[PDB]
């Protein structure tokens, strides 16, 4: 269990605070935590929100316990680093890290583009140096180019959404970030497409891989019921409105009707959101074209579950750990089956315990996805 990992009294007390949601480590968490505590550079594909972040952090906390504070001198960079592909995912990771580090001595910080660089490069942010830092690649690259941060001081690196970090837009900035090569590297994801894994082999030397659940196409969660849309797109939104009418029943019983809508395009998301807000639906939309402060407020509201209907662009498909996720509608089916499965795993992120509803609309480009639906 968790006690097999040798958790510190702060770590054990925080794990006890995580009860009844944590009474023992998950089997994937059991496979991941002490091997990371063995310091081995590895990559783990598992269920999203399955405590894998906690499994990575506990071994990271143990490794940081073995690290001296003398490397924490002013002006240098952190030794414990984490990467996220979205500012929302990085913010959620920083919020999770700040709870565990309240009873610990690790300083937790977040870095992303589109925010106040004065606060990012602040004297108690950049110069005083922290133990735990989750950073977007753009802000980190800007800091390194402007010498606001360093890369020789790192000792433990974590790559959250590493498959998403392996994006063609995201690979170059990561390689630019790639720097002491002897640091312990751990990557976390939901699944590993093969063409990116060998890319990891570009910078790998005898690593390890930890896979969870079925080794095949693990498309269907046993706790998630799925349906196929046998209707054209033209009334499908109306059918979604009918589903909203069905969600009206979900609005009636108090069983939580937090609905997350998958939209492929930010402008299409805006048009659909204008239609839904016209349709008297309490909808909030988050996208890559949204304002950064507006996106931050919407993310805080969704964390508080303030908007029972929320639309999300390609910026917000995967990695979500949202409490009370009971309604998930792929208003646009994801262009990748991996993306569709990741959006599916974003809901019901409390684990195998919290249930939810999943409905996906079907369009003509997604016709070939019907074989993917098989």
């Amino acid at each position: 269990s968790f006690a097999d990992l040798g958790l510190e009294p702060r770590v054990l007390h925080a794990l006890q605070e995580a009860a009844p949601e944590v009474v023992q480590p998950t089997t994937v968490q059991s496979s991941t935590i002490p091997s990371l505590l063995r310091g081995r550079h590895v990559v783990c594909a598992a269920e999203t929100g399955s405590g894998k972040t906690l499994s990575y952090l506990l071994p990271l906390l143990q490794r940081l316990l073995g690290q001296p504070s003398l490397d924490s001198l002013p002006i240098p960079a952190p030794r414990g680093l984490v990467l996220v592909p979205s500012r929302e995912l990085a913010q959620q990771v920083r919020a999770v890290a700040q709870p565990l580090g309240r009873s610990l001595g690790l300083l937790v910080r977040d870095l992303e583009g589109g925010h106040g660089m004065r606060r990012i490069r602040l004297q108690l942010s950049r110069q005083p140096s922290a133990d735990v830092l989750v950073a977007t690649p753009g802000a980190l690259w800007k800091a390194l180019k402007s010498r606001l941060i360093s890369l020789e001081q790192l000792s433990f690196l974590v790559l959250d959404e590493a498959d998403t970090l392996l994006d063609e837009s995201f690979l170059e900035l990561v390689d630019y970030i790639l720097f002491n090569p002897k640091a312990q590297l751990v990557l976390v994801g939901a699944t590993f497409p093969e063409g990116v894994g060998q890319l990891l082999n570009k910078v790998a030397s005898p690593d390890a891989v930890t896979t969870i659940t079925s080794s095949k196409l693990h498309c269907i969660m046993p706790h998630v019921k799925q349906t196929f849309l046998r209707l054209k797109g033209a009334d499908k939104v109306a059918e979604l409105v009918h589903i909203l009418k069905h969600r009206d029943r979900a609005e009636r019983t108090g069983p939580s009707g937090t609905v997350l809508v998958f939209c492929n395009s930010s402008s299409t998301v805006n048009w659909l959101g204008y239609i839904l807000d016209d349709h008297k639906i309490q909808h909030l939309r988050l996208q890559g074209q949204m304002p950064a402060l507006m996106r931050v407020g919407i993310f805080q509201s969704f964390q508080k579950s303030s908007r029972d209907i929320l639309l999300c662009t390609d910026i917000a498909s995967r990695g979500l750990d949202s409490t009370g996720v009971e309604l998930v509608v792929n208003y646009d089916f994801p262009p990748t089956l991996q993306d569709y499965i990741h959006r599916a795993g974003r809901v019901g992120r409390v684990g195998s315990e919290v249930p939810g509803t999943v409905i996906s609309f079907v369009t003509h480009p997604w016709d070939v996805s019907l074989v993917q639906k098989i």
Binding site: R38, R40, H41, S69, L70, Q184, D207, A208
Partner: peptide, 29 residues
């Protein structure tokens, strides 16, 4: 995997609980 040092790692014993109690290289010589 993770290769650690085969022999004794440098700066291991001289750390101790009180790092500030070390004499420290005050002179560069």
């Amino acid at each position: 995997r993770r290769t650690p040092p085969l022999g004794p790692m440098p700066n291991s014993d001289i750390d101790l609980s009180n790092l500030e109690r070390l004499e420290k290289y005050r002179s560069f010589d």
